[PDB]
Amino acid sequence: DITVYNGQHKEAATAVAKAFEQETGIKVTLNSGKSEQLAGQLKEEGDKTPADVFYTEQTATFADLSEAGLLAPISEQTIQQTAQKGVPLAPKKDWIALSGRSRVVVYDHTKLSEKDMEKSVLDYATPKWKGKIGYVSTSGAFLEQVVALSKMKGDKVALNWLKGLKENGKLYAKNSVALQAVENGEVPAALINNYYWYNLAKEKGVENLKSRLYFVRHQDPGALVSYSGAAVLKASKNQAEAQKFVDFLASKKGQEALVAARAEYPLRADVVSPFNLEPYEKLEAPVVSATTAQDKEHAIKLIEEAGLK
């Protein structure tokens, strides 16, 4: 039996855990919490941790653990299973990316069409969109978006974009509330993450939604994909089983379990999501370095500068 420090959505974690048991008979115990916290805890615990595996919604959390020397190597064959172009690879082969979540532009198709959409996420923060583009400043993925902007285009640009949002956009407290606002016709477009819409579409059927999604693509900063992944603790005293779970997560069957439970993009290229997501490769996601603590700190400041929050 193994213990998984889980920083991923409970349903996602539950679904893969169950499916693993069903296939192997090995029982999975989940310890759920926030990725950063768990990451902190693993460092503190060190060689004395109870965890065998760390399963997280953000692969960036692994850089630290890797450098601290806390992670075990994983099979190159397994790593290969999800190594599509643009997918981040652990330089030390001690973690693996499994699935992704994407920024998207959701819009009321009864009011806008694809011809009204912009070529870059940058263009939504302009006077053409005054009072017509919803955003969520307190969202974790918004912050990632800001990091990516600075990284890709510079702080000036990043800062200018936030400024444009303050002046022209409509602030919503949550992604779910922004999506509703679009659906209720309060605002015609919103910057959110893919999965909320896919969920709604499942629940209610596309035919009954006013909203549609628009993917910027072209390696635009607004085409940002955030990656989920896993790693085996070098302190694990249950290597074989722990490795087996990681291998399972990258297999067709583990990828199939995950996708049915959460609208994330599978990284294997032979798995089809039931939420009707497009293939990963069609997203044309930019390649951006992992976000660090300092990156986050830096983004918060820009946010602050712009009078946001």
Curated annotation (Swiss-Prot):
GO terms for molecular function: metal ion binding. It is found in: Periplasm. Changing residue 80 to K: In strain: TN106. Induction: By iron deprivation. InterPro entries: Ferric-bd, SBP, SBP_1_CS. Fe cation binds at residues 9, 57, 195-196. One of its GO terms (cellular component) is periplasmic space. Changing residue 14 to A: In strain: TN106. Disulfide bonds: none annotated. Belongs to the bacterial solute-binding protein 1 family. This is Iron-utilization periplasmic protein. It comes from Haemophilus influenzae (strain ATCC 51907 / DSM 11121 / KW20 / Rd).
